[model samples]
Target: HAPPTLWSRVTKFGSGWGFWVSPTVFITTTHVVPTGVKEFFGEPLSSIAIHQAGEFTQFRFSKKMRPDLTGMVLEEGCPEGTVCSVLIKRDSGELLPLAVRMGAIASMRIQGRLVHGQSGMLLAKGMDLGTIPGDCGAPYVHKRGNDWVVCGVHAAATKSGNTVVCAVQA
Candidate 1:
């Protein structure tokens, strides 16, 4: 029989979201890593790892962009069945399975710097199923034709229950 597939390939960065982009590369928010500013349950980027169920694989911080975007490289590529893609859409108003309503593009600012602009941010607002602790770095995805496309990476949230996502494009 074929090896069992990973039900969900998501990892946590302190209290934020993180996920693999390739066998050796991953993406998350820069705020999740140490940068002078304190993060909730934050840890040094070197100490972070990719987690699936109880399995853990160590990684190292590779690079980053302005505002709150970061890239990581795993010590080893993910196991079989793990998939990666960079599928993004802006202001599509597409309904995501995780969120109750459709997602829209919004402007994002972090540390007083504009992260999303003419590029725009992908905002997925959860109704009854809002963001909770350790939901950062979560992938905001939608189904397209027969494939799962990742639109954004969960960065933060509002007091009003909107999930702020970092677009894969910007």
Candidate 2:
């Protein structure tokens, strides 16, 4: 797991957030890595650096992207923050624990057109959990039984409101 603070940073195209999903993999937005631009701050990882034990490593994009979503694969896993496990349930009537907050599924559109995916894409609104500018790639997780599951990834925020739009990975 990488530290929560490490999730915030500036990549080549712009600033964004990311979190570890495995020992060597992390999740972030495609726009952060962009399509062609790479290498930054004289090192790799596109200028985004996560430090641990006084050391850091450069990462590269996995050449994967879906609309506004993307993923990053680290050379190695950081010894910092814990990996995100669960996502908040969409229709559960139970109260969320203090450790997490509530988010929503919203309708997404770009350039006055609805955004669609190969499979199914959903739009989510983060109620009180509204996100900040560089919160892209942030994971929305919640506990179920004894395990955590990721429900969505922060993709973008609406320009007219406090609504936060996320991408649901299938």
Candidate 3:
């Protein structure tokens, strides 16, 4: 079932601890969120989070927000030795825009200042995929060409400690 625009506003797209490189791509850590089918799609297939997660199942959109941009900063902004880039790929057979993606743990800040949500936070850079609840189980990437490529997936919204965290893409 198609989701309501209002629902999209409240949901968080992607999963992990990274940053965005484009409107339809992002990079983050796999450790920030949970793993497994139940965490990715929800208990029932028709669940809202599950549905939102499905929207990114194939990486088909012409342009969609990359989760790497919407990250929760864990440290100082643009600190020394901090990272700000990652590589991605489309692993799914479908034509979805965020089907498969990958990321490396990095850091970010604003004007050399440490900030919350902005200091270490990763934000979206492209089209907003809205919020994706229960988006943890989605795959991040798959093999392609001469190497294992990247792909975006629905990552868990919560940490293992059950604390609410930012949404991270695969």
Candidate 4:
């Protein structure tokens, strides 16, 4: 049910991304969002500024973080070979619901630079989603029983193909 409206609540935060936790309250990386009229990257839904991805779904922001790494995955961090799903809707209606791997802990140096804050490293099944422009704030959602749960948000990426996701609690 939530995945059907996935993009509706998830939106862009400048060059990064965000999502609505409540109708009025959204969340994002503080490093990604801006202040003033440019609060987010999409047109508003009922005055909220979330643009349309399709005739049905919309994507929209705030701020939340946890380096202790709680989420839909394991208690601490997912082991190096763990697998999970991710939801990423880009500016072009390229809605992606795909598989990813727990490539590493974001604490590791990715080519020399570490991901902002302690984050999660999600590897594309084939190196997609992570390097796309304006896709940094993509929400990470997956199934929990008959419902979907919020687990994290896309934060940063390296060309070498590691996606740094900000892990969240269910």
Candidate 1 vs candidate 2, lDDT winner? 1
Model 1: which ten-residue window has the lowest total lDDT? 1-10
lDDT tens per residue, model 4, 1-170: 34455556666556666766554445554445555653333443344544321111223322222222222321223445555555667777777754566555444443365443234455442644454556655665555576555545555555644655543322
Q: Estimate each model's TM-score.
A: 0.47, 0.43, 0.21, 0.56
Tens digit of per-residue lDDT, candidate 1, span 71-170: 3222221122222322221123221234322234445575565553112222333444455445555554444454444444555555555433443333
Q: Write candidate 3's Cα lDDT for 1-170 as tens digits.
A: 11222112122334422223233333333333344444332323233121122122222123344333332222212222232222222233222223212233222232353212211122232343322433332223233243333233233322221221222321
Best by lDDT: 4
Worst 10-residue stretch by lDDT in candidate 4? Answer: 52-61
Candidate 4 Cα lDDT to native: 0.49
After superposing candidate 3 on the true structure, give the runs of residues whose Cα lies further than 4 Å from its correct spot.
1-95, 99-103, 106-131, 146-153, 156-170
Tens digits of per-residue lDDT, candidate 2, 11-115, equal 222355444444234455444544444543234554344332111122333432222333333322211122222222222222221132233333446446443
Per-residue lDDT value at 92 in model 3: 33
Q: Which candidate, 1 or 4, would have the higher TM-score against the true structure?
A: 4
What's the alpha carbon RMSD for model 2? 12.7
Q: Global CA lDDT of candidate 3, please? A: 0.28
- TM-score for model 3? 0.21
Clashes of 1: 5
User: Which regions of candidate 1 deviate over 4 angstroms?
Assistant: 1-7, 34-97, 100-106, 117-128, 162-164
